[PDB]
Amino acid sequence: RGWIFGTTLDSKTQSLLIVNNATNVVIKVCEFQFCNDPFLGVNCTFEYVSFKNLREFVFKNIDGYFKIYSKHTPINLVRDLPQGFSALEPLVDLPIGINITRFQTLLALH
Amino acid sequence: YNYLFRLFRKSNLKPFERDISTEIYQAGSTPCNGVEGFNCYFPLQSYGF
Ligand SMILES: *[C@@H]1O[C@H](CO)[C@@H](O)[C@H](O)[C@H]1NC(C)=O
Numbered sequence: 001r002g003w004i005f006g007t008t009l010d011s012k013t014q015s016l017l018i019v020n021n022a023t024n025v026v027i028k029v030c031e032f033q034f035c036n037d038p039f040l041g042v043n044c045t046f047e048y049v050s051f052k053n054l055r056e057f058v059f060k061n062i063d064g065y066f067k068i069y070s071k072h073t074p075i076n077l078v079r080d081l082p083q084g085f086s087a088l089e090p091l092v093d094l095p096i097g098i099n100i101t102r103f104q105t106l107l108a109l110h
Numbered sequence: 111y112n113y114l115f116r117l118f119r120k121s122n123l124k125p126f127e128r129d130i131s132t133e134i135y136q137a138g139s140t141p142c143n144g145v146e147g148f149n150c151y152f153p154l155q156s157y158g159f
């Protein structure tokens with residue numbers, strides 16, 4: 001459902017949070033008390049709001065911009081990445097300004 | 111003194127990089143352990159306009 005990017009990931013210095021909640025995407029750059037070990041149930045300076053499914057994403061961080069590209073496709077051979085070619089297309093280009101060196105993903109759990 | 115600048119850092123900023131961290135700078139041979147001291151300084155300064 002989303003990702004966390006930064007250096008420490010501890011809110012003593014800045015980190016970028018991205019979350020999808022099926023109705024929206026929500027994006028924040030902040031230093032509040034977030035999760036100790038990130039998951040979801042089944043002190044700010046930027047904010048924004050919008051196995052057959054192979055979903056593909058690309059993330060890169062250049063001159064203070066964080067850039068996202070993506071694609072969705074079915075995969076009839078579901079077992080592993082398919083052998084054919086497809087191209088990802090841009091989503092967003094965010095002026096977030098962070099020195100990102102580490103990242104993590106977010107999962108829905110019982 | 112309500113305005114400040116950074117005098118010390120581990121390395122230069124990249125273009126449009128930004129940094130509000132308050133870690134003590136080690137200027138020399140003795141480490142700082144999270145406080146000012148011998149060869150150890152807070153990274154910000156004020157103009158005193
Ligand atoms: C609030 O943000 C500052 C950095 O701007 C950070 O030092 C502080 O730890 C943050 N608060 C919490 C609860 O982490």
Ligand SMILES: *[C@@H]1O[C@H](CO)[C@@H](O)[C@H](O)[C@H]1NC(C)=O
Nearest residue numbers: 020021022023024025026049
């Ligand atoms: C998704 O997040 C937005 C912003 O907080 C909120 O308005 C919306 O109700 C959320 N959707 C659900 C299903 O909770």
